[PDB]
Amino acid sequence: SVYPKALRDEYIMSKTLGSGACGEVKLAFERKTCKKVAIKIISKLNVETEIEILKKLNHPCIIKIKNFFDAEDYYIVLELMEGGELFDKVVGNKRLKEATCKLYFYQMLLAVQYLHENGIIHRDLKPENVLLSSQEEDCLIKITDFGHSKILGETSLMRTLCGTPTYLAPEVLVSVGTAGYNRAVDCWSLGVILFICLSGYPPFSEHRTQVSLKDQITSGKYNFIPEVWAEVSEKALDLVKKLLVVDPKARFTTEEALRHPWLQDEDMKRKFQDLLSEENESTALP
Amino acid sequence: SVYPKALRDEYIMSKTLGSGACGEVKLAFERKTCKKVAIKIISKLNVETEIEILKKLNHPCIIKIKNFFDAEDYYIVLELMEGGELFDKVVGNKRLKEATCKLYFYQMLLAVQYLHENGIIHRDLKPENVLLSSQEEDCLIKITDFGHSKILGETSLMRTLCGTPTYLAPEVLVSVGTAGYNRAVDCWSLGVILFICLSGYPPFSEHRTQVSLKDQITSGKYNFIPEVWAEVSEKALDLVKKLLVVDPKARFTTEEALRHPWLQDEDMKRKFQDLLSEENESTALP
Ligand SMILES: N=C(N)N/N=C1\CCCc2cc(NC(=O)c3cc4cccc([N+](=O)[O-])c4[nH]3)ccc21
Numbered sequence: 001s002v003y004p005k006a007l008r009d010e011y012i013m014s015k016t017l018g019s020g021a022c023g024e025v026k027l028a029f030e031r032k033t034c035k036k037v038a039i040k041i042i043s044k045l046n047v048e049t050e051i052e053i054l055k056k057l058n059h060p061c062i063i064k065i066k067n068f069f070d071a072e073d074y075y076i077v078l079e080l081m082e083g084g085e086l087f088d089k090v091v092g093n094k095r096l097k098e099a100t101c102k103l104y105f106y107q108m109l110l111a112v113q114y115l116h117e118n119g120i121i122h123r124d125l126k127p128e129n130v131l132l133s134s135q136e137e138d139c140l141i142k143i144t145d146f147g148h149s150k151i152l153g154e155t156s157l158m159r160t161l162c163g164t165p166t167y168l169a170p171e172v173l174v175s176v177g178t179a180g181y182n183r184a185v186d187c188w189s190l191g192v193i194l195f196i197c198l199s200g201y202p203p204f205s206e207h208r209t210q211v212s213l214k215d216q217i218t219s220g221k222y223n224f225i226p227e228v229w230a231e232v233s234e235k236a237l238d239l240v241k242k243l244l245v246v247d248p249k250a251r252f253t254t255e256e257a258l259r260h261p262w263l264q265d266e267d268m269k270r271k272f273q274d275l276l277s278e279e280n281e282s283t284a285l286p
Numbered sequence: 287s288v289y290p291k292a293l294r295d296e297y298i299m300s301k302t303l304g305s306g307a308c309g310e311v312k313l314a315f316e317r318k319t320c321k322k323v324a325i326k327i328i329s330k331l332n333v334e335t336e337i338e339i340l341k342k343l344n345h346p347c348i349i350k351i352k353n354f355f356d357a358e359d360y361y362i363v364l365e366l367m368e369g370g371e372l373f374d375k376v377v378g379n380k381r382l383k384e385a386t387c388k389l390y391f392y393q394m395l396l397a398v399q400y401l402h403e404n405g406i407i408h409r410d411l412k413p414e415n416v417l418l419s420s421q422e423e424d425c426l427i428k429i430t431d432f433g434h435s436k437i438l439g440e441t442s443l444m445r446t447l448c449g450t451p452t453y454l455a456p457e458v459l460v461s462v463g464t465a466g467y468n469r470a471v472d473c474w475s476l477g478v479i480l481f482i483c484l485s486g487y488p489p490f491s492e493h494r495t496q497v498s499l500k501d502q503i504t505s506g507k508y509n510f511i512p513e514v515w516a517e518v519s520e521k522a523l524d525l526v527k528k529l530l531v532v533d534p535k536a537r538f539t540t541e542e543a544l545r546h547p548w549l550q551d552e553d554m555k556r557k558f559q560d561l562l563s564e565e566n567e568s569t570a571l572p
């Protein structure tokens with residue numbers, strides 16, 4: 001099949017930049033400006049509502065939608081993230097220097113904090129869903145793929161608790177203890193991402209062990225290899241450990257992580273602000 | 287304000303039959319047939335989707351929608367249930383004879399079984415949401431008010447479990463043990479309803495006790511008053527006890543309740559079938 005007419009009208013399509021299970025990412029040129037864009041193809045919960053979420057969000061570490069076409073397949077137009085996926089930087093036991101880990105992780109934290117402040121949980125944070133702005137090591141990152149995201153709001157539980165529980169089942173009452181911590185799943189995922197970035201290997205995996213992946217995760221017993229970690233700081237590992245806390249209520253939130261000693265780094269923060277300014281292009285100001 | 291024009295066009299509105307928090311139930315006459323109908327008014331999750339659920343359901347113990355008007359308020363037209371709410375038969379310590387309890391409860395079980403077979407959970411079963419067809423003690427009952435209902439389907443959990451949990455939080459894995467038993471909340475509610483019908487008083491309540499309502503429910507320790515129950519059979523109480531089981535996985539399902547010795551009653555079942563046939567009105571058959 002061909003590209004939809006409406007897409008062809010505005011864009012010239014070019015080479016493949018990447019592939020997901022859902023579909024490819026293509027290079028394209030916007031006809032009006034002659035500038036490069038990326039087009040994510042998703043073949044035919046749903047995409048239109050994901051796009052609606054992303055249209056409302058406004059944060060420099062969250063991907064922005066330039067255009068959208070709902071045709072035979074879905075075509076999503078966004079700015080080019082020439083660095084590609086974080087995945088490719090950590091695969092095959094490759095690892096980033098601690099400084100680069102901190103810069104990237106600070107931005108992930110700011111992004112996820114913004115999401116949680118805005119009543120959104122991502123629920124699919126992993127290195128394949130972190131995009132890099134450039135091939136330079138010091139670059140902005142942007143979180144993508146909101147296909148598993150969920151919008152927080154007034155729960156069925158809250159409506160039930162406007163009393164009285166004469167006919168209400170005990171398990172609903174018991175669920176009150178732990179309700180409203182769904183966002184903590186993103187903080188766990190961030191912990192796994194950080195672990196992988198610092199060490200070059202996954203904390204929980206079926207590689208050379210008889211402990212099931214499930215038991216590894218529920219017990220919180222990550223695979224600690226001293227020689228790999230000797231090079232990494234104690235402060236970096238300390239943060240990892242406060243994010244990979246099994247009790248979701250005790251787990252570090254994004255606010256707690258941002259206040260952690262590891263992220264109290266004015267150099268890293270200077271670099272991030274420098275990177276933000278480079279990205280413009282602003283209008284004149286009074 | 288006035289009734290909507292489209293409603294007035296088809297119906298003549300009459301006296302008030304009842305009141306909810308949401309709004310009244312009115313007597314009306316359908317102009318075409320000159321026959322009596324009930325009109326439920328709900329003032330402006332949502333009603334249109336509730337109406338959509340109820341339009342698809344087809345069971346003699348579940349209320350049917352005749353018409354619907356979405357105007358300043360919502361107007362829902364249904365058959366008249368002249369017996370009114372079950373609530374009025376059990377209030378002020380009044381109680382039904384065991385035989386009448388069995389007939390009504392059998393029908394509630396059939397209704398809720400049908401719901402669960404069809405992927406629907408009611409979540410608001412109580413005596414105010416059970417309607418009686420006539421003022422005769424032996425009558426058909428119909429469950430109403432689907433405003434808290436929920437449609438079962440592929441969960442976020444099921445999509446997550448299509449592996450692999452490298453980045454997945456332990457609490458999600460732990461939730462697997464108890465997932466897919468949301469329907470059991472209806473069985474608990476039925477247990478409370480049955481308790482109230484047989485005894486004339488609620489199993490869990492703040493009346494003359496220092497045990498909090500919440501602690502009463504979560505511990506499963508219902509208020510047992512021997513003198514009130516002496517008249518009721520052991521088989522009736524046995525079923526009550528298998529429905530008011532605190533562990534939702536161990537709780538009786540509607541199928542288990544229907545197979546309970548208390549409901550193995552050919553007289554009651556004869557009466558129900560007789561009542562179904564009276565309700566028609568069928569076309570000629572080959
Ligand atoms: N699945 C879903 N429901 N939503 N998904 C989404 C929703 C928003 C758009 C979106 C974009 C991406 N990915 C890219 O843009 C991208 C990958 C890549 C690799 C190399 C170079 C470049 N590049 O030089 O630009 C690249 N850009 C992956 C997933 C999704």
Ligand SMILES: N=C(N)N/N=C1\CCCc2cc(NC(=O)c3cc4cccc([N+](=O)[O-])c4[nH]3)ccc21
Nearest residue numbers: 303304311324326366367368370371430431432433
């Ligand atoms: N709240 C909501 N979201 N949906 N509610 C609903 C949705 C479906 C319609 C509906 C009907 C009723 N109730 C009646 O019909 C009714 C009460 C009554 C009392 C005395 C006599 C008669 N009668 O002689 O008929 C009566 N009919 C209560 C709630 C709801």
